[PDB]
Design a binder for this molecule. Structure first.
Ligand SMILES: O=C1N=C(NCc2cccs2)S/C1=C/c1ccc2ncccc2c1
Lengths: 297, 257
């Protein structure tokens, strides 16, 4: 534990799931840190309760490092190691030619490690999107912002149905299944993988039905053959337009045979058959994976 | 299903770390095993009133026992601890937790809002924010997957016994959650079907009938002496069809061990 005396604020970075994130500097050690401020003034929000407790258990090279919790009066701080930038802001600063496939390959590989770790420790992230992923200058990438995260049990119960920002939300959530699980986070990584390669979001819908219809236009409209029990799901409609599944060479053109294979397994409709983060690490796509460095913005 | 084994391994690692001190009640100068039984039973009623998950009950109890493992509390403040813990359990576990004002409501207006919110703060400091604790409930649901075949009556009965184990710190504070879940599952399985602690679980948990015996003996006595116990909210609860009315079933006479 710590004292806010030791820290000196540098700049405000932005809002997250909850609270405002700041850049700060430790005056004695010289370490640059990230500070997440929450004004308590209904008590500690369940988001902070969830994020702190889960993040104290999750020590992995690819999950953001929580260093300390400062529990002063009326105000609560979270101290993180500072890396350089979030993936959203990085893709904004990156020129069109700026993100090489070896770097994408590396990022995905690392993210799958962070996700395999989380799921091995009964944690669902439930908000994987570019803004919640952070990079450093040496080639590392880390999952962050566990404010929407929760601990799941085996087997899973019914949990909150709000979950996941729209563009990255799995079909089982949209169609309102009683149970969702580890496979929702895989889906989001699937969309992120495609986003990094094409430099634009895979399914940028504005509503739920718009999101569904965009998924069907790319992957084909699901039926009982591709996904058993889909016609029984609460928000499924028999009136859904029938679109054909299209070639992944045309969905993500710059991607080789191995890359296409993995993405299709990441975007598989049936969450049962959808590839696990663990099993993905052994995919032939990563046979030649290294650790390249990004540009400095 | 790709993570069942990792998760189970991890929960067995954490249950030891999250375990409260066994003989803390003797170090408590004002509260007693009887008073804790009344508090736990009262929280069962609160759970049923606001229709909360069983997991939230088990989580609250874990927090109280850990908090009382290093902090002394006068009898008049025990309910305040219990309230704040239930508030924290609900925030961690529930989709729609009851708002603070409702927790002030069920404390028969003994404590104020600020007091509840300041006790929430303290518990978090003492528990040092470590809330993701394993429970009897979390091992039970994993055990149910080993039924050949699955039986609803068994499941509800095992959850009934595990819930009963929360009441009496003596002797249940000395047994780990995975062990109690072993005893609860076998005892439920033998009462309903007549079958024993299955081989696949011996392979999975490393727990044999002999190792479960010490706990199984205590639990069997709690099941038989249940209608005489001073606290009754768990028997009442489990009369419901939601729990298949398992608390109305007759306990077995002998375990044959
Ligand atoms: O980066 C973080 N993002 C969080 N949630 C959403 C946001 C993204 C960007 C601003 S807010 S919490 C969080 C903590 C954190 C940790 C390390 C960092 N290193 C470099 C830059 C920002 C960092 C933020």
């Amino acid at each position: 534990p710590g004292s806010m005396e030791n820290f000196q604020k540098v700049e405000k970075i932005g809002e997250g799931t909850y609270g405002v994130v700041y850049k700060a500097r430790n005056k004695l050690t010289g370490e640059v840190v990230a500070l997440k401020k929450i004004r308590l003034d209904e008590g500690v929000p369940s988001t902070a309760i969830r994020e702190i407790s889960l993040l104290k258990e999750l020590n992995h090279p690819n999950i953001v490092k929580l260093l300390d919790v400062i529990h002063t009066e009326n105000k609560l701080y979270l101290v993180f190691e500072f890396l350089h930038q979030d993936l959203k802001k990085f893709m904004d600063a990156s020129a069109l030619t700026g993100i090489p496939l070896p770097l994408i390959k590396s990022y995905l590989f690392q993210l799958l490690q962070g996700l395999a770790f989380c799921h091995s420790h009964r944690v669902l992230h439930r908000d994987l999107k570019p803004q919640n992923l952070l990079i450093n200058t040496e080639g590392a990438i880390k999952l962050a912002d566990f404010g929407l995260a929760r601990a799941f049990g085996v087997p899973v119960r019914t949990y909150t149905h709000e979950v996941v920002t729209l563009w990255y939300r799995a079909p089982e959530i949209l169609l309102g299944c009683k149970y969702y699980s580890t496979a929702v986070d895989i889906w989001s990584l699937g969309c992120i993988f495609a986003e990094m390669v094409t430099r634009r979001a895979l399914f940028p819908g504005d509503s739920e039905i718009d999101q569904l219809f965009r998924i069907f236009r790319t992957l084909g409209t699901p039926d009982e053959v591709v996904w058993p029990g889909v016609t029984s799901m609460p928000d499924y409609k028999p009136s859904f337009p029938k679109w054909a599944r299209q070639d992944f060479s045309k969905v993500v053109p710059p991607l080789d045979e191995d890359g296409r294979s993995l993405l299709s397994q990441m975007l598989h409709y049936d969450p049962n058959k959808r590839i696990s983060a663990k099993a993905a690490l052994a995919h032939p796509f990563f046979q030649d994976v290294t650790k390249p460095v990004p540009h400095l913005r | 299903p790709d993570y069942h084994e990792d998760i189970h391994t991890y929960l067995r690692e954490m249950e030891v770390k999250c375990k409260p001190k066994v003989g803390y009640m003797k170090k408590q100068p004002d509260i007693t095993n009887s008073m804790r039984a009344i508090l736990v039973d009262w929280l069962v009623e609160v759970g049923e009133e606001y229709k909360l998950q069983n997991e939230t009950l088990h989580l609250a109890v874990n927090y109280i026992d850990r908090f009382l493992s290093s902090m002394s509390v006068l009898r008049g403040k025990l309910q305040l601890v219990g309230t704040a813990a239930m508030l924290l359990a609900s925030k961690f576990e529930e989709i729609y937790p009851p708002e603070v004002a409702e927790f002030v409501y069920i404390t028969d207006d003994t404590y104020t809002k600020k007091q509840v919110l300041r006790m929430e703060h303290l518990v978090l400091k003492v528990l040092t924010f470590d809330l993701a604790a394993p429970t009897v409930n979390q091992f039970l649901t994993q055990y149910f997957l080993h039924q050949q075949p699955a039986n609803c009556k068994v499941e509800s009965l095992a959850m009934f016994l595990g819930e009963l184990s929360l009441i009496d710190a003596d002797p249940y504070l000395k047994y780990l959650p995975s062990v109690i879940a072993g005893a609860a599952f076998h005892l439920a399985l033998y009462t309903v079907t007549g079958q024993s602690w299955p081989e696949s679980l011996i392979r999975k948990t490393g727990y044999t009938l002999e190792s479960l015996k010490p706990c199984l003996m205590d639990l069997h006595q709690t099941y038989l002496k249940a209608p005489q116990h001073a606290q009754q909210s768990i028997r009442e609860k489990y009369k419901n069809s939601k729990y298949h009315g398992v608390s109305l079933l007759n306990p077995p006479e002998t375990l044959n061990l």
